[PDB]
C-alpha cells in the first residue's frame, strides 16, 4: 500500500478536496495529501481505495468548491470505479453524492449500493431529494440504476441550468429538474459512506475528476 498522491492521475481531484473520516479516526479533515495513507484511504494496484465499516461512518472526499444548481457552466464529477463484492452483513452504503452543505443540510443526490431493496438484490440506487426536510416530511425520487457491476464502470454526475443528470457507462439513467433546490452550498463527494453494515465496505477508484 502507498499514498494515493503517489499516483499522479489522482492529483487534480486531491488538490481540490479534503478527506473526511470518523472523529475517532482523525481529528480533522485531511487537506494535505502528499505522503498520506491510512487503513481507510490508500492506494494498491495504482487505484485510490476507500474503506470504512460501521453504520453512519465514512471515508470520503469532500470537494472544496461550493456551487448552486443554477450554475451556467456544467458542474461535473466523473469516476471510473469498482464496487467489489460487499462482505456478508454490509447492507447499504453510499459511494458518490451531491451534498447540500451548510445551508442544504441533506444531500441533493446519493448514489448507493444495497443488498436488498423493494421498488431487488445487489442493486444500485440514485436518490434525488425533492426537499431538505428531515423525518417523515422528507420527499425523494428513487431511481433504480441496476445490478452492481462486477468490474469497472464509469459514473458521470452533472448539474447544469438547474438539471441533474447521471450517466452509468454512458447510459443516462437520471435526468431531473432540481431548480427547487436553491441552496448555494452544494459540492461533490466520492468514497464510502456506510448507512447500514458493521463490516468494512470498500470503494475502489481507478480515476476521479471534477470540473
Ligand atoms: O431503499 C429505500 O427505498 C428506502 O428508503 C428509505 O429512506 C431513505 C431516504 O429516502 C433517504 O434516501 C435517506 O438518506 C439519508 C442517508 O441514508 C444518510 O443517513 C444521510 O445522512 O442523509 C440522507 C438523507 O437524509 O437524504 O436514507 C433512507 C434510508 O434509510 O435508506 C426508507 O424510506 C425505506 O423504507 C426504503 O426502503
Residue numbers in the entry: 27 to 145, 150 to 241
Which text from the study accompanies this structure?
In heterotrophic bacteria that use alginates as crucial nutrients, alginate lyases depolymerize alginate into alginate oligosaccharides (AOSs) and then into monomers for assimilation into the central metabolism. The overall structures of these PL7 alginate lyases are similar, showing a β-jelly roll fold composed of two antiparallel β-sheets with a deep cleft. The noteworthy structural differences among the solved PL7 structures are the loops around the deep cleft, which are variable in length and sequence and involved in alginate substrate binding with the deep cleft. Structural study on several PL7 alginate lyases reveals that two loops around the substrate binding cleft determine product distribution.
Similar to AlyV, several PyAly mutants and two oligomeric substrates (M8 and M5) were used to determine the structures of PyAly-oligosaccharide complexes. The structures of the PyAlyH125A-M8 complex and the PyAlyH125A_Y223A-M5 complex were solved at 1.62 Å and 1.70 Å, respectively. Except for the sugar units bound at subsites −3, −2, and −1, the other sugar units of M8 were not observed in the structure of the PyAlyH125A-M8 complex, which was similar to the observation in the structure of the AlyVR91A-M8 complex. -3 subsite: The side chain of Arg143 formed two hydrogen bonds with the C-5 carboxyl group. -2 subsite: The side chain of Lys172 formed hydrogen bonds with the hydroxyl groups at the C-2 and C-3 positions. -1 subsite: The side chain of Arg159 formed two hydrogen bonds with the C-5 carboxyl group. At subsite -1, the three-dimensional position of the sugar unit in the AlyVR91A-M8 complex resembled that in the PyAlyH125A-M8 complex. However, a clear angle was observed between the two sugar units at subsite -2; that is, the directions of the two C-5 carboxyl groups at subsite -2 were different. For PyAly, loop1 consists of residues Thr108 to Lys117, and loop2 consists of residues Arg159 to Phe170. More interestingly, Lys131 from AlyV loop1 formed hydrophobic contacts with the sugar unit at subsite -2, whereas PyAly loop1 was too short to form any interactions with the sugar unit at this subsite.
